[PDB]
Amino acid sequence: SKFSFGQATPRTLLGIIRLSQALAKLRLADMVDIDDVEEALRLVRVSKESLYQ
Amino acid sequence: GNLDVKKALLLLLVGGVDKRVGDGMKIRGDINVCLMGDPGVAKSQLLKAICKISPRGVYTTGKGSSGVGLTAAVMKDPVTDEMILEGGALVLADNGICCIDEFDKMDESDRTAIHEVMEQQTISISKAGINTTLNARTSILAAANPLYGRYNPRLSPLDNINLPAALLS
Amino acid sequence: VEVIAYTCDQCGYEVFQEVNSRTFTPLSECTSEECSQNQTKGQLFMSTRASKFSAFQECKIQELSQQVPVGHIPRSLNIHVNGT
Amino acid sequence: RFDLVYLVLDKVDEKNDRELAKHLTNLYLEVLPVEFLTMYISYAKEHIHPIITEAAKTELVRAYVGMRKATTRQLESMIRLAEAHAKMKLKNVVELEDVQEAVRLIRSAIKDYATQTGKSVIQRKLQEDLSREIMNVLKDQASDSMSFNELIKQINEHSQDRVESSDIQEALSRLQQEDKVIVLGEGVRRSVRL
Amino acid sequence: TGRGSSGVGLTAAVTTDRETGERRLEAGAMVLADRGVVCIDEFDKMTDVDRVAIHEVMEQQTVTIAKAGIHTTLNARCSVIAAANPVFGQYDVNRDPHQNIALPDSLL
Amino acid sequence: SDEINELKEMVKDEHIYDKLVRSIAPAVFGHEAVKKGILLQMLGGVHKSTVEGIKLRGDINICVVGDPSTSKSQFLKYVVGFAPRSVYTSGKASSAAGLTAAVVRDEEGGDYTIEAGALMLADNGICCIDEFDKMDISDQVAIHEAMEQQTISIAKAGIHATLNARTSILAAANPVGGRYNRKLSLRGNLNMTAPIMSRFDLFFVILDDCNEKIDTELASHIVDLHMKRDEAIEPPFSAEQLRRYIKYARTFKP
Amino acid sequence: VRKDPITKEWTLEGGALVLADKGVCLIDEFDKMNDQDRTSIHEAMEQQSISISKAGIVTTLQARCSIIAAANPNGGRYNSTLPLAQNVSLTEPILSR
């Protein structure tokens, strides 16, 4: 109960699928692959731990 | 600065149909991002300036269209046809941007109002006039203000947001 | 309303009149040229399809809130439409 | 007022959470009726009202006498879902073996309570030692005077089995009812005499 | 004088029918405050309902209201002057200098 | 009729004191002590009293304490359909109205009007109300006034009112832990104050046991109850022919 | 002060005391509502013939009323050998009337 929230819900898992196809929609070069979702987890790690500074 | 957060929003300004489900499985779409923190750079005109150029994204605040008048209701009118269904924001800003501020304001009606749109498809008027229910397809962008002074980072979080069940799940 | 047509179903002479302000009054039935002047007069009533009708819609204005003086609040005004 | 509860479970559970990912791996790409079962129950609720024979009651008492090894709240409801399961799977008459699935669900109901309100294990010790800490100082003190700075520095540290302030305030309201003490603010009190 | 009835920055839709068929949003207290100064007293000795009004008129120069009538954004150039008192006597030095009145920091 | 003659035969019986106590309700087994009390509450006593002054007590009021989810709920379910116009409340709504008699605000041209509440309508009725622990402290003097003399008074924001609602209460509260202490007294397990106890009669506390014989017979006693049809138990009296019988019983003055 | 109907005025409607010129009230131990009204009855004897001016007219009626009461100690009658200020929950000045 020090800093962090969440206990890894599938509701977070389905959301990370949601924003990936969203970023696959704006930057559509028909490349839904590992690198496209690598852009996605790139955002969830920098949104999280904004309090650790 | 803040290129991380200006990138987190442009993906949500396009949205798109989640999945054409066909069968009766109405899946969740249109995720919602909330902000918090107390800068002195007038955080209001940061977010709301995006809203006044983004498509169909209606501005709101704490006063006025509160969580009871966030949906539609029946009111007084002139000498012409009274008891019309005057609306708030969510019955007219369907499938757009609901850019809210002042989250500690009028919370007795607002805390119902945020769950009822995060819950899919129950924007309704459950009054003594009618029991008809309309759609719900709009993203939410929230900015909660902290408690007095600064949010103490050495203290526990959720000392200033009052909804645990709306947030962590 | 801009034109009128009363029929009395005896002579068929549709009496015309100019339309005045928002309140007016129909006339009698013993005023015409054929169905009048006898012991029997056709009793008048209105007609819809023989009465041409126009468009009408009301709106109110305010001020730009930049050319208002430092004093009083702005006030409204009434406007109408005709034609198309 | 409710009959049986259940809790859902959660763990890390790596073989199952991976399997639960496989479900949501699917259902995105590309008899289970929608009306036929609905008319199947709405006929089958009010037309045949089924019976009850001795074939259930003999096993029924055999369950509870080992169960005693609530009282009757559990007994009234345990036949109703036993009746309805007999009403569901065999839309004619009573069943004698419908009760093993009755005792299947309620045995899982009492799995949730292995571990104050319906419990007295803490309440067989809390009323005892609190009935001891009165009689000692009332045999030391010629008066009934007991101030607030003494009681925090007497009973919070004799034993570490009781909470600090969550249950000591409610500890004295029952002594207010049991002809011992009185309340005079967050300070001085007044105790029992002979 | 800072007596904080609702009307410190609003209208409350007082029309008095204005001779049978005229409804007027009568100016409460901002038509006098324009390009001038005001002063109000006793902040902590007030209810809640004035404090929500002083929030709006400070973040924004204008009030806009639709009570039983017309939405209207009328402009206002105001400048308040405040006067309040601490709560617990002479307790400023032995405690925090902040929170010493503990009215909401929306205004501070 | 013969039914008016039926009373004249039935009044000339001999064991009808025991016939009545065995024929109260099939939802309980055993405990003839509690059964003798609720019958006497069901009938009325005397109310006529001294000249020029006090009206004395009209009746007896008997509560029963016990562990919840036990045989306590059965009498409560029994009387409200059996008694003449007797009502039932839980009394948790202790701040708006109901138990506490509380005036309504002005509506349609009248302020200060009287209110409802399942207390002033127990005229020829035996109102029933449970769970005394969970309410506040304000009603605990209010019904304490409603117990001694048969009226209540109110002068709340409007003129004084004196309504004479003669009543007959019957309660079922809860012990302090669910389990009844044995070596101690009931002075600790009553969980009320002192003077309302002496304002009351005795409660006839229901005890329990985990005995290997009494469970099976209560099991057999309960299974014939929720039979679709096994009406083998014979109460010697009906619902109605007991009802007219006590209606013959009320009209004396011994 | 009962409020007006539509074409009426804020008039003055009495309650208990102005009716009871020579009668009876009761204050035993409404413990929660003790601090509410006790500041209105111990100025009926001290400032005898009391009336008030809330949101209306400033008048003063006349009421030479009599008070009896039937107070109730917290438990038994001898809750202590200690004196009456230990026994009742009232304080001195309202008791001293």
From Swiss-Prot, chain C:
Localization per Swiss-Prot or TrEMBL: Cytoplasm; Nucleus
Function in brief: Acts as a component of the MCM2-7 complex (MCM complex) which is the putative replicative helicase essential for 'once per cell cycle' DNA replication initiation and elongation in eukaryotic cells. Core component of CDC45-MCM-GINS (CMG) helicase, the molecular machine that unwinds template DNA during replication, and around which the replisome is built.
Assembly mode: Component of the MCM2-7 complex. The complex forms a toroidal hexameric ring with the proposed subunit order MCM2-MCM6-MCM4-MCM7-MCM3-MCM5; loaded onto DNA, forms a head-head double hexamer. Interacts with CSM1 and MCM10.
Additional free-text comment from the UniProt record: Present with 166 molecules/cell in log phase SD medium. Early fractionation of eukaryotic MCM proteins yielded a variety of dimeric, trimeric and tetrameric complexes with unclear biological significance. Specifically a MCM467 subcomplex is shown to have in vitro helicase activity which is inhibited by the MCM2 subunit. The MCM2-7 hexamer is the proposed physiological active complex.
Entry's family note: Belongs to the MCM family.
Name of protein: DNA replication licensing factor MCM7
Naturally occurring in which organism (per UniProt): Saccharomyces cerevisiae (strain ATCC 204508 / S288c)
Phylogenetic classification of the source organism: Eukaryota, Fungi, Dikarya, Ascomycota, Saccharomycotina
GN (gene name): MCM7
Curated annotation (Swiss-Prot), chain D:
Motif Arginine finger: where in chain: 1-3
Coiled-coil parts of chain: none
Stretches that traverse the bilayer: none
GO molecular function terms attached to this record: ATP binding; ATP hydrolysis activity; DNA helicase activity; DNA replication origin binding; helicase activity; single-stranded DNA binding
Keyword Magnesium: no
Its job: Acts as a component of the MCM2-7 complex (MCM complex) which is the putative replicative helicase essential for 'once per cell cycle' DNA replication initiation and elongation in eukaryotic cells. The active ATPase sites in the MCM2-7 ring are formed through the interaction surfaces of two neighboring subunits such that a critical structure of a conserved arginine finger motif is provided in trans relative to the ATP-binding site of the Walker A box of the adjacent subunit. The six ATPase active sites, however, are likely to contribute differentially to the complex helicase activity.
Subunit-structure text: Component of the MCM2-7 complex. The complex forms a toroidal hexameric ring with the proposed subunit order MCM2-MCM6-MCM4-MCM7-MCM3-MCM5; loaded onto DNA, forms a head-head double hexamer.
Entry protein name: DNA replication licensing factor MCM4
Lineage of the species this protein comes from: Eukaryota, Fungi, Dikarya, Ascomycota, Saccharomycotina
Residues of the full protein shown: 701 to 929 of 933
From Swiss-Prot, chain F:
Outcome of substituting residue 72 to A: Loss of MCM2-7 complex helicase activity
Protein name: DNA replication licensing factor MCM6
Subcellular location as annotated: Nucleus
Gene assigned in the entry: MCM6
Function: Acts as a component of the MCM2-7 complex (MCM complex) which is the putative replicative helicase essential for 'once per cell cycle' DNA replication initiation and elongation in eukaryotic cells. The active ATPase sites in the MCM2-7 ring are formed through the interaction surfaces of two neighboring subunits such that a critical structure of a conserved arginine finger motif is provided in trans relative to the ATP-binding site of the Walker A box of the adjacent subunit. The six ATPase active sites, however, are likely to contribute differentially to the complex helicase activity.
The protein's assembly and partners: Component of the MCM2-7 complex. The complex forms a toroidal hexameric ring with the proposed subunit order MCM2-MCM6-MCM4-MCM7-MCM3-MCM5; loaded onto DNA, forms a head-head double hexamer. Interacts with MCM10.
UniProt-annotated binding residues for ATP: 66-73
Similarity section: Belongs to the MCM family.
MCM domain residues: 16-223
Organism: Saccharomyces cerevisiae (strain ATCC 204508 / S288c)
Chain ranges for the short sequence motif Arginine finger as given in the UniProt record: 198-201
From Swiss-Prot, chain G:
Source domain of life: Eukaryota
Resulting phenotype, residue 97 to A: Loss of MCM2-7 complex helicase activity
Protein's cellular compartments: Nucleus
Miscellaneous note of the record: Present with 1690 molecules/cell in log phase SD medium. Early fractionation of eukaryotic MCM proteins yielded a variety of dimeric, trimeric and tetrameric complexes with unclear biological significance. Specifically a MCM467 subcomplex is shown to have in vitro helicase activity which is inhibited by the MCM2 subunit. The MCM2-7 hexamer is the proposed physiological active complex.
Function: Acts as a component of the MCM2-7 complex (MCM complex) which is the putative replicative helicase essential for 'once per cell cycle' DNA replication initiation and elongation in eukaryotic cells. The active ATPase sites in the MCM2-7 ring are formed through the interaction surfaces of two neighboring subunits such that a critical structure of a conserved arginine finger motif is provided in trans relative to the ATP-binding site of the Walker A box of the adjacent subunit.
Subunit structure comment from the entry: Component of the MCM2-7 complex. The complex forms a toroidal hexameric ring with the proposed subunit order MCM2-MCM6-MCM4-MCM7-MCM3-MCM5; loaded onto DNA, forms a head-head double hexamer.
Family indicated by similarity: Belongs to the MCM family.
Identification of the protein by name: DNA replication licensing factor MCM2
Naturally occurring in which organism (per UniProt): Saccharomyces cerevisiae (strain ATCC 204508 / S288c) (Baker's yeast)
Gene responsible for this protein: MCM2
